Design a protein around this ligand. Structure first.
Ligand code: CAP
Lengths: 481, 139, 9, 139, 139
């Protein structure tokens, strides 16, 4: 027969199954290029599996390999398209955990598309039977690839100019309770909070269009509350209108309405998806709007150290898509946050370049190729009694948000807003004069001193004095110093 | 009404010693300082009037204090502000701004509401001082 | 260690 | 009519010695060779039938000549062609193709003209051999 | 060519004992059985000709075997198929179908390619038997 005579007898291309590390997916003597995409994975092999074979399997199944030999490989420049595992090391103070470095060719990805990049890096590797657990810890995205993405629509610098606000963190609050209020009652809270001294207020992530309140009603009343407050104070004000919806057509309809009534900003949720997010960031740039991103759902895969994706990677992907704000943690609030890991997140979102810093979880040096900066947002069970800690851990480019910490004031919403602004102003002034505001004694005294000229602040300090959330963290570092 | 533009407007008017300290903090960073004036406080009024060129390499707050003293006795009733600029790659913008002189009294603003399609309103913010007198004689 | 900065030029 | 697909169709049918030389030229470059067959010669008929797998590391034209000899005595009346592939980055495609066997007679094709909007025509090219008999018995 | 419609066309023609067993499997489920015929085997030819009404409450394959025997000696050369229907809420559709009689020879089909805008082609699949003779005399 012709078929039998034309059978491949080459050692590498004869039919059958061979190890991934003998298929060309492991290369300890590999030289990395400045155009290559790189990834760091924390792998846990099944009892009996060789650490190097596991790394080679992850590299092959995330590039061009399958479980058995295929001759069709000879119709392509195979060596150029194969990903290569090049370094494997044990995780310190651990047995059965190893770190693995992998390099990918630039031509494997579609320009400007996050769905495509993720389809390769996280497509099916996490479900492989030969591994018991797996976690993507970091990535190095090259200058060449960064240039095919838009980056933030507004950016921190242009945004401060749009608000005429410079040299201090911005302030905000969420409307409470989460659900149940009508459009007219929603506008009343916005008017009150802004008038007391907040820069912005926001709808809860779960507020969209429901039987108790339809969206068009909420948008109209909110613009009346914003204009009233701005005319009474002489400042630019705003509220995050939520445009999250079930279909792309409905999203666009809500974005075009908010622009028509003159909103300076709008907000979206992470549950919408990468493709919907990319479309929204392109629209905001073409229509002069600020875009806020709520990270609903992130903790389903970013909480445990043994399996999933580390938040610092999500930070990079979202800065590439082009969002203007993103929730990043508080350290002292009611949600999870280790101080060393959080400092790493803030740096990834605000710096022009990153240098290796193991104790902070920074594994790769990386430049941002002049992409604009993304503003971090701190929210979740925090109060004016903790002002000294917030200034020391979060920095100056950040939005501090107080929901229960404002509406829960006994003397009204306007009183709550005033207590928060005064506390901040006094702390920054003291800092700029060279005081040790972080000391457990200096910090509180500074607030106490300011309180003797502001009744609202005195009331708040006495109310939430002994309030704290101390619990062991889940996601921690693997290095020290 | 008290105009709440600036970073320290929820605190009492600052003393000269207080102002000097904030200036000393900006120069320790290497920032450039300048002084501006206006009698139109609309929140979208971006360009205030410049008082001379910015002080780029001055390394002593006394030089900044002197210039502010002159403007105070030279300019008409209105508002004065001090700004700090950072020309570092990645910023190239202002990084601080605070008010340092106010008029005896400020009446404030009111809203005008033009009705357009459906229930939509087009809003306009109006100043009492501006609508009443020309520049130079508003306060 | 410090070989991670030299292995990834 | 004579079908003019291929690079040497304006020359007489090539001898076996001529064919061997062209093969020797492709292997000196390091190209992979294969043989195909069909009885439908429409110019948009991209996929001819494959005769075994491509000969990747064969370094002697005699191996290619043998395979062509077999097809000649095994396949039905129709057309046979030899192709050469280059898998180098920047190419990864075919780089040569020529006919090496023809039917005793080829009637050719005719055009059908469907009239659509205004003066536009939608054309269809039709083969006499195909329309008359099923595959295997067209020539 | 062999027509590959049906669930067992990659196996040899089934014997009468083989057919009876498959019928016995469908009745154990409570399904309704029917027999159809056609001389046009286009893959989009959905409605074959019906041979009587479906056998709804027959509980013995011998009844189905008898009907198939009649069609075989009564119908013209062509194709015959047996189908099983399930009227349960959630289904209400056919759940099995296989060929049980073929013509002595099937020439097959060929493709016609109309060229439209850009590089687009509109394809049409054509049968040799249909184009040559009217229904009743195609095989
Ligand atoms: O729904 C809530 O719980 C919040 O409005 C908190 O309001 P409170 O101020 O009343 O606590 C925020 O969405 C969370 O901070 C989100 O968490 P994160 O920022 O970590 O994504």
């Amino acid at each position: 027969s012709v078929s039998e005579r034309t059978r491949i007898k080459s050692d590498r291309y004869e039919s059958g199954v061979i190890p991934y590390a003998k298929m060309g997916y492991w290369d300890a003597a590999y030289a990395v290029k400045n155009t290559d995409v790189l990834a760091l994975f924390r792998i846990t092999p099944q009892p009996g599996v060789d650490p190097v074979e596991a790394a080679a399997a992850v590299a092959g199944e995330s590039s061009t390999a399958t479980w058995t030999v295929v001759w069709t490989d000879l119709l392509t420049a195979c060596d150029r398209y194969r990903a290569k595992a090049y370094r494997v090391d044990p995780v310190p103070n651990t047995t059965d955990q190893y770190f693995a470095f992998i390099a990918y060719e630039c031509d494997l990805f579609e320009e400007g598309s996050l769905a495509n990049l993720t389809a390769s890096i996280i497509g099916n590797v996490f479900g492989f039977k030969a591994v018991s657990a797996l976690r993507l810890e970091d990535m190095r995205i090259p200058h060449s690839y960064l240039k095919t993405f838009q980056g933030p629509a507004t950016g921190v610098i242009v945004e401060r100019e749009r608000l005429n606000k410079y040299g201090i963190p911005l302030l905000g609050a969420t409307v409470k309770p989460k659900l149940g209020l009508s459009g007219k009652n929603y506008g009343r809270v916005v008017y009150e909070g802004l008038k007391g001294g907040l820069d912005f207020l926001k709808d809860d992530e779960n507020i969209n269009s429901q039987p108790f309140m339809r969206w068009r009603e909420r948008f109209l009343y909110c613009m009346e509350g914003i204009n009233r407050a701005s005319a009474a104070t002489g400042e630019t004000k705003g509220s995050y209108l939520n445009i999250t919806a079930g279909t792309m057509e409905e999203v666009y309809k809500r974005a075009e309405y908010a622009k028509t009534v003159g909103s300076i900003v709008v907000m979206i949720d992470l549950v919408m998806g990468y493709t919907a997010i990319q479309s929204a960031a392109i629209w905001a740039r073409d229509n002069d709007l600020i875009l806020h991103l709520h990270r609903a759902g992130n903790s389903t895969y970013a909480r445990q150290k043994n399996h999933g994706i580390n938040f610092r990677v999500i930070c990079k992907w979202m800065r590439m898509c082009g969002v203007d704000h993103i929730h990043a943690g508080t350290v002292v609030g009611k949600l999870e946050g280790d101080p060393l890991m959080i400092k790493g997140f803030y740096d990834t979102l605000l710096l022009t370049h990153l240098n290796v810093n193991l104790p902070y979880g920074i594994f790769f040096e990386m430049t941002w190729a002049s992409l604009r900066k993304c503003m971090p947002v701190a929210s979740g069970g925090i109060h004016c009694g903790q002002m000294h800690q917030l200034v020391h851990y979060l920095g100056d480019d950040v939005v501090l948000q107080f929901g229960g910490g404002t509406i829960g004031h006994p003397d009204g919403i306007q009183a709550g807003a005033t207590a928060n602004r005064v506390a901040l102003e006094a702390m920054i002034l003291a800092r700029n004069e060279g005081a040790d505001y972080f000391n457990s004694d200096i910090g509180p005294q500074i607030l106490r001193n300011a309180a003797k000229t502001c009744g609202p602040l005195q009331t708040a300090l006495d109310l939430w004095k002994d309030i704290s959330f101390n619990y062991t963290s889940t996601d921690t570092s693997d290095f020290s110093v | 009404m008290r105009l709440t533009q600036g970073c320290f407007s929820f605190l009492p008017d600052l003393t000269d010693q207080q102002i000097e300290k904030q200036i000393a903090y900006c120069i320790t960073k290497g920032w450039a300082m300048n002084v501006e004036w206006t009698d139109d406080p609309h929140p979208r009024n971006s360009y205030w009037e410049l008082w001379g060129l910015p002080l780029f390499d001055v390394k002593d707050p006394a030089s900044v204090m002197f210039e502010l003293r002159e403007a105070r006795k030279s300019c008409a009733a209105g508002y004065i502000r001090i700004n700090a600029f950072n020309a570092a790659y990645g910023t190239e913008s202002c990084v601080m701004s605070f008010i340092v002189n106010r008029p005896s009294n400020e009446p404030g603003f009111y809203l005008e509401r033009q009705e357009l399609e459906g229930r939509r309103i087009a809003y306009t913010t109006k100043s009492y001082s501006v609508q009443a007198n020309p520049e130079g004689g508003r306060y | 260690a410090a070989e991670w900065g030299s292995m990834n030029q």
